[PDB]
Each structure stands twice: as structure tokens, then as C-alpha cells.
Design a protein around this ligand. Structure first.
Ligand SMILES: *[C@@H]1O[C@H](CO)[C@@H](O[C@@H]2O[C@H](CO)[C@@H](O)[C@H](O)[C@H]2NC(C)=O)[C@H](O)[C@H]1NC(C)=O
Ligand SMILES: *[C@H]1O[C@H](CO)[C@@H](O)[C@H](O)[C@H]1NC(C)=O
Ligand SMILES: *[C@H]1O[C@H](CO)[C@@H](O)[C@H](O)[C@H]1NC(C)=O
Ligand SMILES: *[C@H]1O[C@H](CO)[C@@H](O)[C@H](O)[C@H]1NC(C)=O
Lengths: 102, 53, 175, 175, 175
């Protein structure tokens, strides 16, 4: 005699709350994270030329402190400096060290 | 380590797929923008209205 | 959302509809049935994917910048060096927060719109052969077997074919 | 706004309706009357309040920054110190201006939507018992005393109860 | 757009209508004809022009700032001087990109809305004298010469005058 068509939309057993203009938290069906908050902890040696300073700081590799002579003529895309790198040659100082390093 | 990653941060490399990152403000290469937030969900679907009602 | 269809005149949603985002459910003389609409489903998916592209994977590339951590107290320059970066991060954090807010308000109103569009597409196909219940359902005033229901679903429903039947029932006499 | 109800098909507004934002006005055999709709009124109020929260009272906390006023001409650094701050203030002023613009466009379109939603909620309740005048009014084609008018206002109006009466008048004969 | 009228239920557009943005086309007993609607056309034009003003011709005025190009390598300060400017340009480039995106989404949804508004204005004028085909056309169930068609176009169409005629045809008998 008569029939019944009903329009509708899907839903899911577990939505995710999202912020909007009016709602701080409202439930959508699905959503993605736009903020990256994790690292592997290691530095990939590619595609950038990562030259590790090890016990030396760029400045000492520059001046040629003996333990650093191993860097003579090195190049890099990113020179990495370690926290406990040390200088073991004539005591010195670099007025405006930050600029020479930069 | 031996792997591939354009974005390097002092905390180690991080994937540059998402637009922003909360790992470190110091970055090198193709990296996401550093922001104070830790999570930012972009809705990718309609509202979810279960048969709760 | 702005359209009052999803979380409005359409009570709740179907966790059962897993082959689409929008669709139909029906009951005729012989039974019940259900089926997802691909068109509206793709419109929604397509818009959200477009939106998703603009945001995702669009990183700048920066190399040597300024320093941002310091070993000793220095004064005027490091203050400035810190202020520049701090200022930068807050404006970028404002940028992110606002984008997700506007984007999400927009995705919700949009998908609301696509439900309602389907509804008006169907309402218009059904001409004088059906009346709206107001819960997202049309009460078809004539016999409509599953093939009939499908013709509607795929927009080939010819309302002239069922007019007289429909009209009659919609306007029956107490006799 | 986008919905064409407020400052559109609904001529003007009621300074007289002080117990709500949206509501009804009617005229039947015995008289006239008026009453505010709470639901739509709260939807509007609620959304605007949500929006109001995100903006209001969310201040950062900053302590020692850079200097911004100077006693003597200095050159390179003070130029930079001034440029950093000036640059910061303009980007923040852009931020404020745009937010109010987008927010306001949004509040207007939103409240437009809630009027229209009410209208479609009512239109759907009235089934074949009423026809739309187009100025926001439905012409109910059957006797509807204040209790009848209220049943509509609180969504319990049963249109089957008044169908035959309504239909008859909507489709009277020149006889 | 959000409204499903333009690039939705209204198939395509008229390159032929050059005196307006929105309008009508008709076919009656004596012929065919066409004419642009000024109102909707001005609403669209007006909103877009308002939007256009806010953006256009609103430049700041800046005079002595910092230097931005350098002859020699210097270090710490020039790094900072470059970082400040670079940072400024990216935040401004984000600003421009986003504005055009939001503005354009908005202009499209807006003009969609104005088409649909016209449609609902006309739908409401036609009362029970016409039925919707669903491609943007109303099938007027009564004789409507060009003067009749114009009365609709300029909103003076009185549907009581043609009711009985219309009703009759909309609900003819197989006899
Ligand atoms: C990334 O590394 C930094 C240090 O390089 C971590 O930040 C410090 O961590 C603790 C806890 O979050 C705080 O008390 C320090 O003050 C933080 N320092 C800074 C500058 O923020 C950071 O949490 C690391 N994050 C990840 C995900 O590895
Ligand atoms: C009619 O609708 C679509 C149009 O492409 C078609 O693919 C569909 O399968 C048709 N329905 C059936 C049952 O064939
Ligand atoms: C029917 O509508 C609401 C539902 O909560 C109720 O509170 C209201 O007072 C009712 N109307 C009357 C006159 O009781
Ligand atoms: C009726 O509509 C407008 C109202 O201003 C008027 O200017 C128009 O010319 C009228 N139509 C005709 C043919 O006069």
C-alpha cells in the first residue's frame, strides 16, 4: 500500500572529540593528528650530510686542536656538536665566538 | 643511525608528514612548524551521533 | 550543524551502514532493506580530502637560523634572540589552533549539508507521491517493491508512473 | 545571512518578544497570542557562549621580554628591537581584526540558521494541514485554539487528528 | 557549495544571461523568454564588493625599518636580522594564503545561497499553483502568459487568482 524510505548517515561505536569554533570538544567519527610529538631518538644520516663532531667542537676542528685534526677539510650539511666535547690544546678564547661558529 | 629523514631535531629525526610539531623548536631541513600544542585533531568525518537517542 | 540534518531532524546515525556515509533504509510490503549512496559519500570524502591535502605535507625547508638555547646569561641580544623566537612560536600556535577550529566547524557544517542535499534530491524525485515524516523519512503513498525503492536510490524513479496511485492514498475518503 | 530567514523572508523582528530569541505569534478564532521557543533560543545562546569562551579569558603569561621604549638614539640593535616588536603588533592586529570578522559573519549566519531550523521543524509538523504564506507564517487550514497552537509549539501536534478538516479547506469547491 | 543549487540541482549556467547573475527563463503557450533578477544579483554583488573593500587598498605605511640585504658575512646579528624578516614574511604568506582560501570558500557558498534564496522566494510565491521539477524549474499548472510570468518575476503574482485552475490540473481525473 505504502512504503517508507529513510535517509540517514553512518556513525561509529567510537568517535573522537575535536575542537571547533563553538565547541571545545565535540565528537566526529574520525580525525587525524596535525602535531608531531615523537622522535625515533636517532639522527638519520640521510639525505643530509651529517658530520658528527664527537669529542670536538667546530671551532676546535677549525683551529686544528690535535684531537680534532681528523676534521681537516671536512664538509657537512649539518655539523653535530656533542654536549661533552672538549678542547685540549693551548687555552684560548674567541671574542664573539658565536659569530665565528655561526 | 642509518635511515632516511629530511627533518632532524636535536631530539632525533622526526617525520615531516603533519603540518606542525611539538618536539623541539630547533629544526633543520624540511620540518613541520613548531607550536606549543601537543595534540591538534583535524576532523576528517561528520559528527558521530550514535543511537544514544 | 548549519543545516539541521545530522544531529537535528535526523535522530541518530547508523553504525550498521558500513559501505557508505550516507544512504537509505526502507520498508515495503515484502520487507526491509538498506543501501549506501555513493555520490554524497564521495562529495564528502572528496571535500575533506581536498582540505586534508592543503594542510598535510606542505613543510617549508629552513637550514641555518638563529640559536635558541643558551649556556650563559648575556643580556640584550639573547633577550632579543629569545623574544623573536618566542614571538614566532605563539603566532604559529595561534595559527594552528584557529585553523583546526575553522576547519572542523567547516567539515561539520559541510557534511551536514551533504546529508540534507541527499534529502532534498530524494524529496524532489518523489514529487506528489510521498510525504515527509520529519525524522528523515518519506512515507511513499503507493506500493514500492525493492526495485521501486532502488529506482529512487539511483535516481531513475518516474513519478508519473505512480502518480494516480499515490495521490489517491494521500487523499483518501472516509467512505 | 546564508539562510535567508532573518533579514530575508522574515520581514523584521519582535522587540516585544523578551522571553526568548525565537518564538511564535498566532491568531485563531478566539484571539491572538505569542510565546518564545526555548530550544532554538538555547542552541543560539549555547553556540555563541561556546565561541565566547574560546576567545575570552585565555591570556598568555609573559614576564621579562625586550625593551620597547628608548631614551637615546642607538642604531642597528634598537632598529631591530623596534622592528621585532612592531612586526609582532601588526601580525597580532591582523589576527584580531580577522577573528572578529570571521566570528561575526559566523554568528550571523548561525543565528539565521536557527531561525530557519525552527521554521522547517514547524513546517514538517504541520504536514498537509497548513500552507506557507512566505513571510514566516503558516496558514493553518483548520480550527486551532490556543491549546492546539501550543501542541505545535511544544511539538506534540498530531496532524492525523486534523487531516480531513485541513485537507477539505485547503481544497474547497466553488459550490 | 553548501547550498546545492549552483553546481548541484541547477545543472549548468547561462552564458546567455548577460544582464544579471540570476534570473528566469520560461515557456508558456505563446513562447519562451528570459530575464535577470536584480535583487539577488545586487545582494551577491554587494557582499562580494564589501568583502573586496576590506581586503583592497588598506596598506600600512612604514618608513625606516631594518636592513635586509648584506654585503659581508657578519654572524650573530645579521643571522638574527635575517631570521626576523624571514619569520615575518612566512607568517604574512600564511596570512595571505589562508585569507584567499577562506574568502573564496565563502564567496562560493554565498553566491550558492543567493541562487537558492531566489528559488525559495519563487517557490513560496507559487503556492499550490506549481510543482517543482527539480532542475531549477517549476511546472506552473495553469496558463501563464508573459505578463503572468512577469508578475512572478517582480513578486506581484497573486496565487488566489489562479488557484482553482492550478489545483484542477495538478489533480486531474482519468476521465
Ligand atoms: C625533546 O627534547 C627537549 C630537550 O631537548 C625536551 O624538553 C624538555 O623536557 C622536560 C619535559 O618535557 C622540561 O622540564 C624541559 O624544560 C624541556 N625543555 C624544553 C626546551 O622544552 C622535550 O620534552 C623532548 N621531547 C620529546 C618528545 O622528545
Ligand atoms: C542504477 O544506478 C547506477 C548508475 O551508475 C548503476 O551502477 C546501478 O548498479 C544501477 N542499479 C542497479 C541495481 O543496477
Ligand atoms: C509541553 O512542552 C514542554 C516539554 O518540556 C513542557 O515543559 C510544557 O510546559 C508543555 N506545555 C505545557 C503548557 O505544559
Ligand atoms: C514590477 O517590478 C519592478 C518594481 O520596481 C518595476 O520597476 C518593474 O519595471 C515592474 N515590471 C514592469 C514590466 O513594469
Amino acid at each position: 500500500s505504502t512504503a517508507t524510505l529513510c535517509l540517514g548517515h553512518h556513525a561509529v561505536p567510537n568517535g573522537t572529540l575535536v575542537k571547533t569554533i563553538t565547541d571545545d570538544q565535540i565528537e566526529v567519527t574520525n580525525a587525524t593528528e596535525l602535531v608531531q610529538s615523537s622522535s625515533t631518538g636517532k639522527i638519520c644520516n640521510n639525505p643530509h650530510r651529517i658530520l658528527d663532531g664527537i669529542d670536538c667542537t667546530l671551532i676546535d676542528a677549525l683551529l686544528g686542536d690535535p684531537h680534532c685534526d681528523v676534521f681537516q677539510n671536512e664538509t657537512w650539511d649539518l655539523f653535530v656538536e656533542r654536549s661533552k666535547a672538549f678542547s685540549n690544546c693551548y687555552p684560548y678564547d674567541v671574542p664573539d665566538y658565536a659569530s665565528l661558529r655561526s | 643511525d642509518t635511515c632516511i629523514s629530511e627533518c632532524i631535531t636535536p631530539n632525533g629525526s622526526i617525520p615531516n608528514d603533519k603540518p606542525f610539531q611539538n618536539v623541539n623548536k630547533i629544526t633543520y631541513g624540511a620540518c613541520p612548524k613548531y607550536v606549543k600544542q601537543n595534540t591538534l585533531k583535524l576532523a576528517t568525518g561528520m559528527r558521530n551521533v550514535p543511537e544514544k537517542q | 550543524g548549519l543545516f539541521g540534518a545530522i544531529a537535528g531532524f535526523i535522530e541518530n546515525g547508523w553504525e550498521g551502514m558500513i559501505d557508505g556515509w550516507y544512504g537509505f533504509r526502507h520498508q515495503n510490503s515484502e520487507g526491509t532493506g538498506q543501501a549506501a549512496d555513493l555520490k554524497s559519500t564521495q562529495a564528502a570524502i572528496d571535500q575533506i580530502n581536498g582540505k586534508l591535502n592543503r594542510v598535510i605535507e606542505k613543510t617549508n625547508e629552513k637550514f641555518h637560523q638563529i640559536e635558541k638555547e643558551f649556556s650563559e646569561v648575556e643580556g640584550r641580544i639573547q633577550d632579543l634572540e629569545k623574544y623573536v623566537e618566542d614571538t614566532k612560536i605563539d603566532l604559529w600556535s595561534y595559527n594552528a589552533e584557529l585553523l583546526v577550529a575553522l576547519e572542523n566547524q567547516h567539515t561539520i557544517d559541510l557534511t551536514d549539508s551533504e546529508m540534507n542535499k541527499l534529502f532534498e534530491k530524494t524529496r524532489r524525485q518523489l514529487r506528489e507521491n510521498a510525504e515527509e515524516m520529519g525524522n528523515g523519512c518519506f512515507k511513499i503513498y503507493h506500493k514500492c517493491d525493492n526495485a521501486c525503492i532502488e529506482s529512487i536510490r539511483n535516481g531513475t524513479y518516474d513519478h508519473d508512473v505512480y502518480r494516480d496511485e499515490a495521490l489517491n492514498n494521500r487523499f483518501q475518503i472516509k467512505g
